[PDB]
């Protein structure tokens, strides 16, 4: 009767991996004969199978069925092994296989805590994923970022640790600098946004990349042909999260200033997107604290009228962030704007 269509797809994938593993065990560096060349994924119809699994993974019912059959392990194993075998290849079959595999993993980690945990526990795969950010396929990078994004969203303690340990933050930030396509960059930044919320080390590792803060401030005035605000919302959200670290560092503060950050950030308080506002409010909350030059430069661009608008908003993060930023500016005035003078 019952076809077990999905089971048969996973068996193919499991089988191919066993064969690759067998080839890896024979063909190590201290090596025996090369009278057995590698398994090639084209020769065992692997794209088709992973492709169909990828397709089915969009639907939630199918995901539930895969999860009973251990589909996540299987697909992650497949991705890992094709990376470990063929490196940073350009072959279309390997890149397509890797993409489909990654998309399936994006879908299987979406909304599922057990799977996020599980995939993160697979450390050889995590390393393989992170290394793919250096691929020449930005379409693949877009996928890998998307995986990393979902793993970093509500990561438990272990998953967070692992994500840091495999060098994900520093690799995505370097990835971002080189990305030429918008869709790719959206995912890269979305992942970084999630990751920057985790811990100090991640914030630190972002700021510590050559061109990073320059680039991030640049995203705040990104010109989209997509007629979309998602790059500004993401890059701004990253900046807001790292700004706690920037606040207390002058070298970094300086890089913002020489790219007109605070000027731009004030224009964001106007902006129509509640996200762009919330981001700019929380960024200023930290940059308006305990630094005299920036404190005054904000007075001299009329931040106080601007922040007075927002203090009575129903949106808590706008209300807090603008009030807090205002309070810093109030309680540390240039003489000119004191109550005693100029009433």
């Amino acid at each position: 009767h019952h076809h077990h269509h999905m089971l048969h797809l996973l068996e193919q994938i499991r089988a191919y991996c066993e064969t690759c593993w067998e080839w890896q065990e024979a063909h190590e560096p201290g090596m025996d004969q090369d009278k057995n060349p590698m398994p090639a994924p084209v020769e065992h119809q692997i794209c088709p199978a992973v492709c169909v699994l990828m397709k089915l993974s969009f639907d939630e019912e199918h995901r539930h069925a895969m999860n009973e059959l251990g589909g996540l392990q299987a697909i992650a194993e497949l991705l890992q092994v094709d990376c470990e075998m063929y490196g940073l290849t350009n072959d279309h079959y390997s890149i397509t296989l890797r993409r489909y595999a990654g998309m399936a993993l994006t879908n299987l980690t979406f909304g599922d805590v057990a799977n996020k945990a599980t995939l993160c526990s697979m450390k050889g795969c995590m390393r393989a994923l992170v290394a793919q950010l250096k691929s020449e396929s930005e379409d693949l990078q877009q996928v890998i970022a998307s995986v990393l994004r979902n793993l970093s969203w509500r990561a438990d303690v272990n998953s967070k640790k692992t994500l840091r340990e495999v060098g994900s933050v520093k690799a995505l930030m370097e990835c971002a600098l080189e990305v030429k396509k918008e869709s790719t960059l959206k995912s890269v930044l979305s992942a970084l946004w999630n990751l920057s919320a985790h811990c100090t080390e991640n914030k630190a590792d972002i700021c510590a990349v050559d061109g990073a803060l320059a680039f991030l401030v640049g995203t705040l005035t990104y010109r989209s042909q997509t007629n979309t605000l998602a790059i500004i919302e993401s890059g701004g959200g990253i900046l807001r999260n790292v700004s706690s670290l920037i606040a207390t560092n002058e070298d970094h503060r300086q890089i913002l200033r020489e790219n007109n950050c605070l000027q731009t950030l004030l224009q964001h308080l106007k902006s129509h997107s509640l996200t762009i506002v919330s981001n700019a409010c929380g960024t200023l909350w930290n940059l308006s604290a305990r630094n005299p030059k920036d404190q005054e430069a904000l007075w001299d661009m009329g931040a106080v009228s601007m922040l007075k608008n927002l203090i009575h908003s129903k949106h808590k993060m706008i209300a807090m962030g603008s009030a807090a930023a205002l309070r810093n500016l109030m309680a540390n005035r240039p003489a000119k704007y004191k109550d005693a003078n100029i009433m």
């Binding site: 990828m54 993974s57 980690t109 979406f110 877009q142 994004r149 992942a191 946004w193």
Partner: peptide
């Protein structure tokens, strides 16, 4: 950024 399905 939250979580999402694959594009």
């Amino acid at each position: 950024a939250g979580e999402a399905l694959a594009d």
